[PDB]
Every structure is written in C-alpha cells, then in structure tokens.
Paper text:
The BD-FAE structure belonged to space group P43212 and contained one molecule in an asymmetric unit. The final model of BD-FAE was refined to 2.06 Å resolution and it contained the residues from Gln2 to Glu292. In the crystal structure of BD-FAE, a sulfate ion was bound to the active site, which originated most likely from the ammonium sulfate containing crystallization solution. It mimicked the binding of an acetyl group to the catalytic triad. The interaction area of sequential molecules within the polymer was determined using PISA server and revealed 1055 Å2, which was typical for strong intermolecular interactions.
The His-tag was not visible and the N-terminal tail showed weaker electron density than other residues of the protein, most likely due to its flexible protruding nature. Overall, the BD-FAE crystal structure adopted a typical α/β-hydrolase fold, which was consistent with the above mentioned BLASTp results.
Author numbering: 2 to 292
The structure:
Amino acid sequence: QDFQMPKGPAEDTYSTSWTNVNYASDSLESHNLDIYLPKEQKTAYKAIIIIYGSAWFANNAKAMASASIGAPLLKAGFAVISINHRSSMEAIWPAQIQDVKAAIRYVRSNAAKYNIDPSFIGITGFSSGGHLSAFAGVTNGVKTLTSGDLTVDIEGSLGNYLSTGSHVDAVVDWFGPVDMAHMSNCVAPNDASTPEAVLIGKKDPREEPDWVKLISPINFVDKDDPDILIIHGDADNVVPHCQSVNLKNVYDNAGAKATFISVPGGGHGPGCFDTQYFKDMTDFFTEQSTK
C-alpha cells in the first residue's frame, strides 16, 4: 500500500550500522560508504566490500547493493561495506577504480574502529560493480597500468590512508563486463554509444585498443591473483554470458583459481539472486576467509 523498495539490508540482519561515511576525506557523496556488522555479535568480523551495478553511471546506489546481497553476507558472519563510486559522466576512467581502491584503504586502515578484522577483505559486485571488484582482484599492488602510449593511475592518491594496502583477498563477480574487446556479439568492441564508451571519455572502443585493454580485467589475470567466483545467467540480456566464460577460461589458462557458476534462465540479476547462489557466494567467501 505504502510501499518502499528495500533500502539497505533488513533491520534484523545487523547489530550495527554506520551510514554515509566518507572514505576520501572530502565532501562528495560519490565517496561515501555504509558499514554493517552482523546480528550474531562477535569481537571482530572479517569484511566483504560490495559494489552496485549501474553501467558505471550511478554515484549514489550503495543502498541498492546492500539490499540485494548484504543480508546473506551479514548472516554468513561478515561485516558488509557498501560503497559509492563516481559516475563515468563526472570522471572518466581510471576515476572509478581509484575510488574503489581508496575505499579499500579506508576500510583496512580503520578496521579496528568498526570491529573489522582486516585479516580478510573480500570484494564483490554485480554488473559494472562486478567489473570493479574484478579489476581490483587482478591489480593488487599496482599503481599504474600502461598500454601502448596510454598510462592510467589505478591506485590514485585519494584520501588520507595512502600507506595502507589497497588489496583484496577474494572476489565474487556477479555477471560483470570484464572483456570489452568482445562485448559486441561476444566478438568485437562496442561503438561509441555504449556505457564503456562513456567510461573511456566518449571515444569509440573500436578505435581504442589501449583504452579497451586497460578497462578490461581479463587482461591482467595472474597465477598468484586472489581466487575468484564468477556467477552469470545464461539468459543475461545486458552483459552477455560469454564474458564470464572468457574470464574463467583465462583464470584456467593462467594457473589461477576461478569457479564459474552459470544460472540457467538467469537474467541480469533475475534468477541469480536466489538462496542457492547466495550460498555459493557465502560458502566461497567463508572458505577463503579461513584458508
């Protein structure tokens, strides 16, 4: 009757909540995040960072990501930290990834204050958030990436915790676009009308091999990189299934560890956010948290 779309995780799934905390020591809402500790109270919680999907367009949707995936993470026993990032329309790449990295230095540096054990900081996201999650899980320890004559600052200088590591320990990628060389028909780059074109500054990806390489985490997968779980629906009409197939193939051929879960009849979210696959995520994140 009076209806309210779910805003953040349900109230009974957490004991403690800090909302609209800035992680960049500035005044931008694109640089805020929210933190939730489980109901089952403990001395410390290992942490999972989450990122909304939005074709990189949104800068204010951390409550959607919380509402979608936060409850199973809280019930599994992890602190859940949901972040904002800047819109592709207000800062082109690498801005989004510098935001994620800054958010990570924030969580790790201040873990104690939030009763976070920084022993483990996993990361997850859906769609473009899954992209950003994955881009972090293949760039632990990297401050710039260069392709041809193009150089991008991945770590950035955002905020006041630059000495703290900006690394993540495990990744769950929910149907993210991770191979932009093959987004069109799964064989080619898209044209300049698409969200990756805006991400690289309204250039035609078909003309920009270097930009396309440096927004595509599939290009940096290494044997030693943190393990990853990839979940994609085989009827996804927005980001094609082939993306996740490719990412898994690359993890497999580089000597790294990827699990790929394909969701039959799964849309771009629909059918994928079932108990079954939330469990795949929480089981994964638990095994990683303990190993």
